[PDB]
mmCIF file of C-alpha atoms and ligand atoms in Angstrom:
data_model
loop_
_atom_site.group_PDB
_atom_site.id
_atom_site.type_symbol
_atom_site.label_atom_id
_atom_site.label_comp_id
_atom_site.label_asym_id
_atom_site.label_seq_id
_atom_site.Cartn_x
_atom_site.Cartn_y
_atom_site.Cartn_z
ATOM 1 C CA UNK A 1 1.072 17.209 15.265
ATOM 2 C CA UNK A 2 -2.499 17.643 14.737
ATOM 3 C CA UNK A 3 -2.420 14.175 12.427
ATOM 4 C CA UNK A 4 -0.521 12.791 15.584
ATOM 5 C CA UNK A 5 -3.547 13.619 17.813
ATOM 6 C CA UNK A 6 -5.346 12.079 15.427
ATOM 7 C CA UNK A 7 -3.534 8.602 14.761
ATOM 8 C CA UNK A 8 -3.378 8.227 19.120
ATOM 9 C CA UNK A 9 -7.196 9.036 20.009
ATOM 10 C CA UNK A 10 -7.679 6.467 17.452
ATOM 11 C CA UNK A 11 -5.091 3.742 18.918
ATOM 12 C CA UNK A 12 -6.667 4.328 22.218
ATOM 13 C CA UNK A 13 -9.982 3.627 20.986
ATOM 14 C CA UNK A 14 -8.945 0.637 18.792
ATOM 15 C CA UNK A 15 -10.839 2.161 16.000
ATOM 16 C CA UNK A 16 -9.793 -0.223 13.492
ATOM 17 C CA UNK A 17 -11.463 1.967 10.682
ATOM 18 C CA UNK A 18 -9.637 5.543 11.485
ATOM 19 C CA UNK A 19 -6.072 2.865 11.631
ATOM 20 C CA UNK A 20 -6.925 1.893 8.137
ATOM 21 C CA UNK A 21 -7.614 5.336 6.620
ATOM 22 C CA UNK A 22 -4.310 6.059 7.936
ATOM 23 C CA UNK A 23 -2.350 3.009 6.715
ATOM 24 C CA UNK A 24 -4.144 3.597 2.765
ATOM 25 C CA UNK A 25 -3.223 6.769 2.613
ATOM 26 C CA UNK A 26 0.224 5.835 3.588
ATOM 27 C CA UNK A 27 0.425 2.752 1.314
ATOM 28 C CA UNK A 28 -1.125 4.112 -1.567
ATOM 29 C CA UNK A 29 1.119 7.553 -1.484
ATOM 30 C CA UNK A 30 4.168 4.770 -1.017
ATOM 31 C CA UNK A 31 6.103 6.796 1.447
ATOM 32 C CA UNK A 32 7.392 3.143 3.354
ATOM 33 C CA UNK A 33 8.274 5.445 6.640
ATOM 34 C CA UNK A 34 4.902 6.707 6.803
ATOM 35 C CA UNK A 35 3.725 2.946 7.230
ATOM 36 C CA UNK A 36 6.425 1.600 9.244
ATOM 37 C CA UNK A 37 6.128 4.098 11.802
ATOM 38 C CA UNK A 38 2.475 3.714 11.979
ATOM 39 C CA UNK A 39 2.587 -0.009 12.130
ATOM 40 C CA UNK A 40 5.273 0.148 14.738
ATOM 41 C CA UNK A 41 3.765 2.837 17.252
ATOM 42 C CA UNK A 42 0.100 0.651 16.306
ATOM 43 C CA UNK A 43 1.653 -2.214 17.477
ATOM 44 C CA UNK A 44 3.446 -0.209 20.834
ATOM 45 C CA UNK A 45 0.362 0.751 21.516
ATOM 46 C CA UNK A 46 -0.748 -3.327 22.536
ATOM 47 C CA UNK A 47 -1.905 -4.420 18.885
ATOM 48 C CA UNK A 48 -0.197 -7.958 18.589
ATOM 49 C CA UNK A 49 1.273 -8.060 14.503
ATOM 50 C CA UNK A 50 -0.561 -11.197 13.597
ATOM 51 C CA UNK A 51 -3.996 -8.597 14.402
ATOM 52 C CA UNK A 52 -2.081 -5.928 12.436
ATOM 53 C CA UNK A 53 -1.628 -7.933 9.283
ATOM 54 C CA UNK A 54 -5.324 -9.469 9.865
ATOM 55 C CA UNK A 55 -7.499 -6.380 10.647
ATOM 56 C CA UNK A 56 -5.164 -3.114 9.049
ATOM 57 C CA UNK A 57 -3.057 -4.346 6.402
ATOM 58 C CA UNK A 58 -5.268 -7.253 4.860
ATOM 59 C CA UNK A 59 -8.714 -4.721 4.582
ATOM 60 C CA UNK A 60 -6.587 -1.867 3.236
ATOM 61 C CA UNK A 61 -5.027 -3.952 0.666
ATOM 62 C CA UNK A 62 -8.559 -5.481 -0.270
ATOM 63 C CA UNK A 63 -10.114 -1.952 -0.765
ATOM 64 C CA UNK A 64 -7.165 -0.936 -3.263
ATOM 65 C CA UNK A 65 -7.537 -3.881 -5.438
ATOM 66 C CA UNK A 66 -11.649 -2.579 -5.574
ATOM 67 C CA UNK A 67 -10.336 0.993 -6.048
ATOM 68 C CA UNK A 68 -8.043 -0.177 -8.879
ATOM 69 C CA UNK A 69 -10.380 -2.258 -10.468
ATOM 70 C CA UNK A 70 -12.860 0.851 -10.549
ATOM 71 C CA UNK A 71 -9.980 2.858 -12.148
ATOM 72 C CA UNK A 72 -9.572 4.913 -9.108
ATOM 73 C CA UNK A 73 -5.915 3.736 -8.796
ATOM 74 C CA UNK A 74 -3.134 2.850 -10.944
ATOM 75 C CA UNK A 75 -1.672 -0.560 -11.198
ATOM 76 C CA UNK A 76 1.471 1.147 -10.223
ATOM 77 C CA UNK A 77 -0.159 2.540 -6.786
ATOM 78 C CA UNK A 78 -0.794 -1.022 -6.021
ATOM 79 C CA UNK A 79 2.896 -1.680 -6.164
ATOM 80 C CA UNK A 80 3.633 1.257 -3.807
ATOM 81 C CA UNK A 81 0.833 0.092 -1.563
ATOM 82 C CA UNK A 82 2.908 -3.713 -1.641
ATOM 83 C CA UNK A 83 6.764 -1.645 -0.902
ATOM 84 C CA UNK A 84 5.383 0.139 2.178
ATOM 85 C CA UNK A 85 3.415 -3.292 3.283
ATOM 86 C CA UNK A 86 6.510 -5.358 2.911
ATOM 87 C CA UNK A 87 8.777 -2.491 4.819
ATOM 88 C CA UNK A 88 6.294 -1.838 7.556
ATOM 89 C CA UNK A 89 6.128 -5.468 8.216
ATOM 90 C CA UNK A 90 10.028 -6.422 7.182
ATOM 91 C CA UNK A 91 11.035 -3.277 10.483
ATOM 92 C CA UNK A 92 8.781 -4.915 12.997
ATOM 93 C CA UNK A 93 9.593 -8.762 12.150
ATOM 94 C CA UNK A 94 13.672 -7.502 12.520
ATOM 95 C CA UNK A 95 12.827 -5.860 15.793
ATOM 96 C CA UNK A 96 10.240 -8.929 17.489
ATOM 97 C CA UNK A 97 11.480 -11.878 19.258
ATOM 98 C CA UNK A 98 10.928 -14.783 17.807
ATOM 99 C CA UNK A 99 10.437 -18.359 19.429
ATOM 100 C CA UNK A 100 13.752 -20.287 19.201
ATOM 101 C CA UNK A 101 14.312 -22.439 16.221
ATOM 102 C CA UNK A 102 12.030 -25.893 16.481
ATOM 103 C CA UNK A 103 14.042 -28.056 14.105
ATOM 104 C CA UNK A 104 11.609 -28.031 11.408
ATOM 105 C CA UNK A 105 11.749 -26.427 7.555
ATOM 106 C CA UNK A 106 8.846 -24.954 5.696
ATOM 107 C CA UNK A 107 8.583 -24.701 1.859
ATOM 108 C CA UNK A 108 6.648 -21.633 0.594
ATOM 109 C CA UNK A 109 5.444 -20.367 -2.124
ATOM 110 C CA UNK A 110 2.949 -19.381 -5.059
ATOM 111 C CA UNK A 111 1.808 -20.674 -8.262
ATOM 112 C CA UNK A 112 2.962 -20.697 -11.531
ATOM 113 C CA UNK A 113 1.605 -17.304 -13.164
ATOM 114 C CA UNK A 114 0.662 -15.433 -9.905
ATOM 115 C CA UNK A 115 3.019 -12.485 -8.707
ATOM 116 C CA UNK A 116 0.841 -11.816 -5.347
ATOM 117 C CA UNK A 117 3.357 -12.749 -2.826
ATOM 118 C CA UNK A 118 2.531 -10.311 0.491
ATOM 119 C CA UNK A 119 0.010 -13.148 1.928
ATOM 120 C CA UNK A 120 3.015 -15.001 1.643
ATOM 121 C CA UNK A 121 5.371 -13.205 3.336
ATOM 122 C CA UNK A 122 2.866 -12.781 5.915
ATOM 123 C CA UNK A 123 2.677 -16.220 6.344
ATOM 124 C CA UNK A 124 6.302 -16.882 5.856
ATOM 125 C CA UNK A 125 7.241 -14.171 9.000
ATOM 126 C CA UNK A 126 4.153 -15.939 11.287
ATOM 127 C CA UNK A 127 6.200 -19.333 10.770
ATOM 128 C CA UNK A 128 9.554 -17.481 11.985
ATOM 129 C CA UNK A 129 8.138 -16.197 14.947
ATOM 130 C CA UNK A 130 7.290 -19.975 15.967
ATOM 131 C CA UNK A 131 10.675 -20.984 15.120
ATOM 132 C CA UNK A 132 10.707 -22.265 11.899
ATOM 133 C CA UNK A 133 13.322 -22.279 9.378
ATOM 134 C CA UNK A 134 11.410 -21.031 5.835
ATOM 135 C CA UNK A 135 12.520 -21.596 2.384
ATOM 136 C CA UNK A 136 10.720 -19.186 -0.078
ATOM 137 C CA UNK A 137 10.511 -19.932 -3.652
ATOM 138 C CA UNK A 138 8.707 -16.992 -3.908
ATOM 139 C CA UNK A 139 5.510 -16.331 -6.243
ATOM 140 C CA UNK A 140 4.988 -17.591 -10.034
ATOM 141 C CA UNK A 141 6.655 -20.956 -8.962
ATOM 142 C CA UNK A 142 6.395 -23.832 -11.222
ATOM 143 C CA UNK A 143 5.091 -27.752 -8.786
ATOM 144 C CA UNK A 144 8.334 -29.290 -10.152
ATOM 145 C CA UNK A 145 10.222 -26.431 -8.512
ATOM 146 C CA UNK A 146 8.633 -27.224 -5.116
ATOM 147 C CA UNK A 147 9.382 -30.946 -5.995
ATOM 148 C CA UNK A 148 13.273 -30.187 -6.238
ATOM 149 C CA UNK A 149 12.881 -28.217 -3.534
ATOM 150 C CA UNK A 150 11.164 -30.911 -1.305
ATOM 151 C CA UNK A 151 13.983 -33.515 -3.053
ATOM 152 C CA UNK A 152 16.461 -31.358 -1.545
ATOM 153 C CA UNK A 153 15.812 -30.658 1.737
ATOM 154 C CA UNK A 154 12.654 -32.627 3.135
ATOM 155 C CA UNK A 155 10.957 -29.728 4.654
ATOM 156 C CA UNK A 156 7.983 -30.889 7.122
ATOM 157 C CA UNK A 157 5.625 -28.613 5.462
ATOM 158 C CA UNK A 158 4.264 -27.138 2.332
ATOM 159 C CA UNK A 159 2.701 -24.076 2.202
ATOM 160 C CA UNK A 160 0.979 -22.189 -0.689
ATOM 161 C CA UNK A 161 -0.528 -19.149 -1.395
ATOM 162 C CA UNK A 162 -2.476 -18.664 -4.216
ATOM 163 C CA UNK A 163 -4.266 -15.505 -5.557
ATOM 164 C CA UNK A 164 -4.938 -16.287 -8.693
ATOM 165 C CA UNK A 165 -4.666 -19.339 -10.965
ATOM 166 C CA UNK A 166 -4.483 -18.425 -14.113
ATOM 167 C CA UNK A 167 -3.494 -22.318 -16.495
ATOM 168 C CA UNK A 168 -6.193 -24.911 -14.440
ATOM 169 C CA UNK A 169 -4.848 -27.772 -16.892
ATOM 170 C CA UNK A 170 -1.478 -27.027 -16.273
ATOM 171 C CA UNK A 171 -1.565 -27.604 -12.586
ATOM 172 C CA UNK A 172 -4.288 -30.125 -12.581
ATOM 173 C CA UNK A 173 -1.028 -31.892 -14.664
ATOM 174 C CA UNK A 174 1.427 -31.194 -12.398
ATOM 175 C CA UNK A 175 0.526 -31.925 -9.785
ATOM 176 C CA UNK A 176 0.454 -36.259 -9.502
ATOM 177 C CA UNK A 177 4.174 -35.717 -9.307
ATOM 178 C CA UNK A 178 4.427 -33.012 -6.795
ATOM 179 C CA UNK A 179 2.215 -34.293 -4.618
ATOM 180 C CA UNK A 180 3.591 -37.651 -4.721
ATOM 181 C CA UNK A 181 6.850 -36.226 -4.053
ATOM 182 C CA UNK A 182 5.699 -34.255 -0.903
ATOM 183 C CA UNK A 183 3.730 -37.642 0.215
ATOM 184 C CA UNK A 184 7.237 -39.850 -0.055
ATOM 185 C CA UNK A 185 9.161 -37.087 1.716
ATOM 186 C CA UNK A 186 6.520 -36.859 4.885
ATOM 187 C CA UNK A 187 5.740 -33.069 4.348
ATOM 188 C CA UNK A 188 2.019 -31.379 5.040
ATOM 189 C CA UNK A 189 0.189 -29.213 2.681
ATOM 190 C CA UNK A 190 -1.170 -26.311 3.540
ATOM 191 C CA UNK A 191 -2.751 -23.978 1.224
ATOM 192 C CA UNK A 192 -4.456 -19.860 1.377
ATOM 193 C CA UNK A 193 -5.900 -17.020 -0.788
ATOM 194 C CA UNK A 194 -8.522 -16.288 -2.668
ATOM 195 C CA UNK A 195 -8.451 -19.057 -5.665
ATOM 196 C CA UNK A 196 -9.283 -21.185 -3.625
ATOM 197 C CA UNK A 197 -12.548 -20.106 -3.136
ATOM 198 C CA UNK A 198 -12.702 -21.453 -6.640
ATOM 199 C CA UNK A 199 -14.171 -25.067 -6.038
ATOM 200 C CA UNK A 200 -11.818 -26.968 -9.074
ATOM 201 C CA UNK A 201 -8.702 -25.016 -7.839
ATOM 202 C CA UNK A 202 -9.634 -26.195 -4.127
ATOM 203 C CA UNK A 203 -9.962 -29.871 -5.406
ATOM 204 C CA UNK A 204 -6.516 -29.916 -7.557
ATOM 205 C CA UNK A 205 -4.383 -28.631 -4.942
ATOM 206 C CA UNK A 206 -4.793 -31.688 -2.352
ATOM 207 C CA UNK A 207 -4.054 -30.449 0.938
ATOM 208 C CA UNK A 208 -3.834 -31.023 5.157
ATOM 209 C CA UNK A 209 -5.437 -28.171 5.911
ATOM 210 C CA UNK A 210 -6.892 -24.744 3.958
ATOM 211 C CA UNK A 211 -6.194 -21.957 5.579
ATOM 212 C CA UNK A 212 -9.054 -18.726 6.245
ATOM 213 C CA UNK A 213 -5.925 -16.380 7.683
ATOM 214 C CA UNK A 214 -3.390 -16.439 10.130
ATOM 215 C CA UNK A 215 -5.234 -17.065 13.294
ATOM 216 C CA UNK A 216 -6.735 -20.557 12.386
ATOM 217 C CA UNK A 217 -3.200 -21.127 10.113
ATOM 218 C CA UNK A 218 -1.242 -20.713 13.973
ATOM 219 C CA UNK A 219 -4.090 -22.983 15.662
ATOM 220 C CA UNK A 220 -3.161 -25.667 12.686
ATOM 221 C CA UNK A 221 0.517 -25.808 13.434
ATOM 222 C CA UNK A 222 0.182 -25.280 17.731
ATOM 223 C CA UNK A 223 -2.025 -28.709 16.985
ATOM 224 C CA UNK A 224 0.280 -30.404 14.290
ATOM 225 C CA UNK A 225 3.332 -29.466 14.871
ATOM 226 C CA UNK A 226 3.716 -29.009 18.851
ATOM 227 C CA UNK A 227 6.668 -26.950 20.197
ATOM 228 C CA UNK A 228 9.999 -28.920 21.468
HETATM 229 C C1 B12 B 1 -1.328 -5.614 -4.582
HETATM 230 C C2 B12 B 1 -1.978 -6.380 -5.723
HETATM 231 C C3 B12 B 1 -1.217 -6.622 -6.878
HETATM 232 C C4 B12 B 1 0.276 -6.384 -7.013
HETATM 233 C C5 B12 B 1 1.047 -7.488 -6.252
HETATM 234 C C6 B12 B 1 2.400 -6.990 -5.729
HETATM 235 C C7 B12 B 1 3.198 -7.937 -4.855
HETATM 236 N N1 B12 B 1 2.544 -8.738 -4.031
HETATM 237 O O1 B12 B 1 4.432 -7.930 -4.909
HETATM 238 C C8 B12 B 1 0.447 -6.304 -8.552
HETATM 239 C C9 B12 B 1 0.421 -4.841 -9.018
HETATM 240 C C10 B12 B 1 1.734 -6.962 -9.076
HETATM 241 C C11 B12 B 1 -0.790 -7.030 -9.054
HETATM 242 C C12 B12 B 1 -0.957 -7.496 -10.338
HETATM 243 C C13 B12 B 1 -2.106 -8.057 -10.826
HETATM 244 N N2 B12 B 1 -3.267 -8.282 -10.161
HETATM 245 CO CO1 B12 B 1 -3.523 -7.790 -8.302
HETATM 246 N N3 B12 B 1 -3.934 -7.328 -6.597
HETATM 247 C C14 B12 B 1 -3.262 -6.839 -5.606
HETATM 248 C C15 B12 B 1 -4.093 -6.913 -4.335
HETATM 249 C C16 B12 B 1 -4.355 -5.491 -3.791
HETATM 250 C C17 B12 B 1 -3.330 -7.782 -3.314
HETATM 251 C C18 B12 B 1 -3.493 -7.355 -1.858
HETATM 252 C C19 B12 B 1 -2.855 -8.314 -0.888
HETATM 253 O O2 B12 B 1 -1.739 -8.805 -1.094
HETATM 254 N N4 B12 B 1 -3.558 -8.529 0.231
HETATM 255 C C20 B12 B 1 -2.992 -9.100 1.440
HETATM 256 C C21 B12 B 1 -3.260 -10.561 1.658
HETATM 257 C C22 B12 B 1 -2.699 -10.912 3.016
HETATM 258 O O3 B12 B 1 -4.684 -10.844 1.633
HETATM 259 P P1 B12 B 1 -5.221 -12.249 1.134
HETATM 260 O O4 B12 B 1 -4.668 -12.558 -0.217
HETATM 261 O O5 B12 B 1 -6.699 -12.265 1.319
HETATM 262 O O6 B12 B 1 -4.500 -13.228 2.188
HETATM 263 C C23 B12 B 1 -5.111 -13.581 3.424
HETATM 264 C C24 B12 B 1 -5.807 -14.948 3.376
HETATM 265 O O7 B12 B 1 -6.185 -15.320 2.068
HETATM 266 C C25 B12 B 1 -4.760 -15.887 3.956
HETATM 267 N N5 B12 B 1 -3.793 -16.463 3.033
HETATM 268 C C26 B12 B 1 -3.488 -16.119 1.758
HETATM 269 N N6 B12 B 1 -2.558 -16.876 1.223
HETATM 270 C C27 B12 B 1 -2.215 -17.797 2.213
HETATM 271 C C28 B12 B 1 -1.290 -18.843 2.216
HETATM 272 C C29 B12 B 1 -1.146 -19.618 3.351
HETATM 273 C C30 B12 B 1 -0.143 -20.747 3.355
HETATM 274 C C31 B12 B 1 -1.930 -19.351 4.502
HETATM 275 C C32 B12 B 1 -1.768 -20.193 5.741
HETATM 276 C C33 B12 B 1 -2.852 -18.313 4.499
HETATM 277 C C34 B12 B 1 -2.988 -17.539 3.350
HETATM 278 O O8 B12 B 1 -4.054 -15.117 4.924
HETATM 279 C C35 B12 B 1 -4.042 -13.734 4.514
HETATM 280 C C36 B12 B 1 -4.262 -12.867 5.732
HETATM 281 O O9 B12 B 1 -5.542 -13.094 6.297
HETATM 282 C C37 B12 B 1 -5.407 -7.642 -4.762
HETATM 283 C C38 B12 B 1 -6.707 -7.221 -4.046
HETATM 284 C C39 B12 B 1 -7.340 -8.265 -3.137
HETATM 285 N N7 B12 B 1 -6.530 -9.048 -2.432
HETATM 286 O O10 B12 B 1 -8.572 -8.358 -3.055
HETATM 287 C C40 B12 B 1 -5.372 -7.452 -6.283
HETATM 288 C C41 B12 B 1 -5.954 -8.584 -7.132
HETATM 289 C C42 B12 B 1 -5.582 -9.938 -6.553
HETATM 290 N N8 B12 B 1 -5.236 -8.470 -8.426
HETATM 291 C C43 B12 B 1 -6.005 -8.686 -9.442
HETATM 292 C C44 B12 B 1 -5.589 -8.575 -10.737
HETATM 293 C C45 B12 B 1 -6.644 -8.637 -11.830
HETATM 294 C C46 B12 B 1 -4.273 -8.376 -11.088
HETATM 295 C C47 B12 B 1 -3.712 -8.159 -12.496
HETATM 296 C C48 B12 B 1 -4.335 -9.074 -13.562
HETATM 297 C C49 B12 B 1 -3.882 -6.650 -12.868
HETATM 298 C C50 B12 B 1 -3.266 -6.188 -14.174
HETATM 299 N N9 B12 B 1 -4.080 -6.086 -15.219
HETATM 300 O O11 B12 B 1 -2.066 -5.904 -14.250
HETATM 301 C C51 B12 B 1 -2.207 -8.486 -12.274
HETATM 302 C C52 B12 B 1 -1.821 -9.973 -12.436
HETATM 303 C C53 B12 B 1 -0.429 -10.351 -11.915
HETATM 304 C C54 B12 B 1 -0.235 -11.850 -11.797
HETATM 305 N N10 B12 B 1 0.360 -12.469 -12.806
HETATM 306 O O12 B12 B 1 -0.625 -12.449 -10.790
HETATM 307 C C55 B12 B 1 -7.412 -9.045 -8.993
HETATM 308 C C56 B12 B 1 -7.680 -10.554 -9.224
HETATM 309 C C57 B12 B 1 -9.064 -10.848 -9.812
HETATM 310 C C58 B12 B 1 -9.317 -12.334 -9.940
HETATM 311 N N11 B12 B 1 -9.939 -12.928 -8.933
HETATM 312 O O13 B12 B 1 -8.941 -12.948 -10.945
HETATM 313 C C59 B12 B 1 -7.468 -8.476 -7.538
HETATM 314 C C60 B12 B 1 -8.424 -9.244 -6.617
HETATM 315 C C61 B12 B 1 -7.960 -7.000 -7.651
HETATM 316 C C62 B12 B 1 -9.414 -6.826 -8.032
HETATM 317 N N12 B12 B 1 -10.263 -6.481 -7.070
HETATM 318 O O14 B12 B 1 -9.782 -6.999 -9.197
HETATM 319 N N13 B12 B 1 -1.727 -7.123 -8.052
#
């Protein structure tokens, strides 16, 4: 009641900071009804999801991978933090309507030897909304997997999210094929997440466009792929 009080004077205010303390202690604690009810009256109260996952969920998961890597969490109170992200997000995505379906396919993914995958289901619930059909191959996916994938069904668009790259000769190998593959098939690339930062990652994965988040990510496909 008094925690209620709380969580509304800060909705009204749009005190981003009091939303997050909220949503961390929730995520971290991994009680998943905790954050979908916060995420769901957040969003009643006029927050679109797409600023949700930019400016709450995105920051608070940030500042757990610092806490963690300070020993102040628990690899394990990561994966709590990821359950209640993925059901917070997962209740409002079932409940929002979404643009009817455009015609179009996109591949998703992440690299071989990464298990971050929440960017990319993110990502993968953003494209929904706009009417896409998505195919995940979900994280730790090998380039000839996308290849079959791409062999298969011809998707319009590629999209990757990449936390960490852990084998740089690996993919630097790899990828000829897949890329080849994507270019004979008429599918875009579009790539995300932190490795890319990393200038020899950024110059392996040859791309359409690099995302920054899911604002400029929307702007990219409103521009390249126009709504029928
Ligand atoms: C949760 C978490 C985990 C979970 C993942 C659970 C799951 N997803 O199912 C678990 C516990 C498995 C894990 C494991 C590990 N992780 Co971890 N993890 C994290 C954490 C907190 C991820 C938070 C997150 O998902 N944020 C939400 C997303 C949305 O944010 P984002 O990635 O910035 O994405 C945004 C943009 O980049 C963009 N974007 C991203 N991808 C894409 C893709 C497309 C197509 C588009 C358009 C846009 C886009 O849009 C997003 C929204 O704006 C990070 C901390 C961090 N991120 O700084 C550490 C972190 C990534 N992990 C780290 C490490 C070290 C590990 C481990 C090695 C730890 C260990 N010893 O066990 C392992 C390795 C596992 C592996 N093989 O990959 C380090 C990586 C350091 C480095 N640079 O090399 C981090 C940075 C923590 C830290 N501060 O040290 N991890």
């Amino acid at each position: 009641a008094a925690v209620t009080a709380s969580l509304d004077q800060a909705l009204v205010a749009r005190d981003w900071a009091a939303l997050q303390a909220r949503y961390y202690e929730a995520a971290v604690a991994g009680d998943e009804l905790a954050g979908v009810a916060l995420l769901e009256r957040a969003y009643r109260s006029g927050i679109p999801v797409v600023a949700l996952k930019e400016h709450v969920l995105t920051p608070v998961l940030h500042l757990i991978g610092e806490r963690w890597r300070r020993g102040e969490l628990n690899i394990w109170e990561e994966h709590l933090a990821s359950q209640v992200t993925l059901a917070a997000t997962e209740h409002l995505h079932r409940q929002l309507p979404r643009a009817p379906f455009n015609g179009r396919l996109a591949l998703c993914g992440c690299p071989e030897g990464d298990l971050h995958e929440i960017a990319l289901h993110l990502v993968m619930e953003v494209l929904e909304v706009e009417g896409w059909r998505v195919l995940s191959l979900g994280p730790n996916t090998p380039l000839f997997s996308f290849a079959d994938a791409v062999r298969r069904f011809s998707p319009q668009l590629v999209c990757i999210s990449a936390t960490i790259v852990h084998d740089l000769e690996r993919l630097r190998r790899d990828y000829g094929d897949f890329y080849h593959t994507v270019r004979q098939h008429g599918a875009r690339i579009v790539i995300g997440g932190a490795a890319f930062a990393d200038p020899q990652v950024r110059e392996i994965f040859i791309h359409d466009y690099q995302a920054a988040g899911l604002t400029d990510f929307l702007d990219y496909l409103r521009r390249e792929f126009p709504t029928p």
